[PDB]
Structure 1
């Protein structure tokens, strides 16, 4: 694929990544073998706003779509702003099946306005 995204399986413990796009490998510098089976939180680090992490936790609990902008880190420790779009995916039976997270790299909203 082209875009940077991961798919998780919420029917398995702690919502592991079951698919990572080529774009996600390139953006994050991790190999597919380093990503499969782990939770999306591994990209976080010291500067990640815990208030934003709570917003994500609530959206996944409530199975609601959300977009947030938060600091994430590549494998080599480079900070990037991640505009992260999380969408629940339901099957034809109305049952949660996946989450997809699409990442866009950039400080789209300036930190001084994000922090207000």
Structure 2
């Protein structure tokens, strides 16, 4: 899956509410969801994976706030908003939501990270600004962990290609691919140390 590197393994036990979406697939589906997200929303992983996150919206959701998310995704920018969402039971909650693109080493947007902080009320003022700093710091910790997981998945994918080329006696291909593997390994090791 698009989530096999996680991300799932790298991501889902982080005790934060988040999803990862893949904007390079139809309708930017959720490809990973944290265990905590499923408990918040009360949906199962199988109900959520492969669907767009908009299912959380309902009758009182501010459509102009939703458009600010829409525009940030289209523009590939971060955004922080607060909007009304509903659990599977129809329980209303306020979702203080932070989106940010996750880039690969070339700077291209590979995934979106979305971090939720649920509450009973629309927060403002110092309470809001603090909650925003929590979810931004959480998003940064997910971004680095997910980037490391994506380098590990790239290393596994190139080792498969190297073995295929070795089986086929494709030695110019082996040479090319082993140089790429050496750069991926260096990148992986560098980022591993930073977050160690």
1:109 aligns to 2:100 (yes or no)? no
**Partner of residue 22 from structure 1, selected from 31, 35, 44:** 35
Greater fraction of residues in helix: 2
CA distance in structure 1 between the partners assigned to 2:82 and 2:62 by the alignment: 9
Q: Deviations over 1:45-103 (max 9, x none)?
A: 00000000111111000000000000000000000000000001110011110000000
SS at match of 1:70: strand
Q: In structure 2, list runs of 5 or more residues that go unmatched.
A: 1-13, 126-196
Q: Distance in 2 between matches of 1:43 and 1:67?
A: 17
TM-score, normalization by structure 1: 0.92
What's 2:81 paired with? 68
How far is 1:109 from its partner? 2.5
Give the SS at the match of 1:67.
strand
1:83 maps to what in 2? 96
Identify unmatched segments of 5+ residues in structure 1.
Answer: 111-116
Which residue among 56, 69, 88 is the counterpart of 2:69? 56
Bigger share in strand: 1
2:24 matches 1:4: no
Taking the aligned partners of 1:109 and 1:34, their CA distance within structure 2 comes to 33
In structure 2, what is the equivalent of residue 42 of structure 1? 55
Give the TM-score of the pair, scaled to structure 2. 0.55
Paired residues in the alignment total 110
Report the Cα distance in structure 1 between the residues aligned to 2:79 and 2:51, rounded to whole angstroms: 21
RMSD in angstroms over aligned alpha carbons? Answer: 1.0
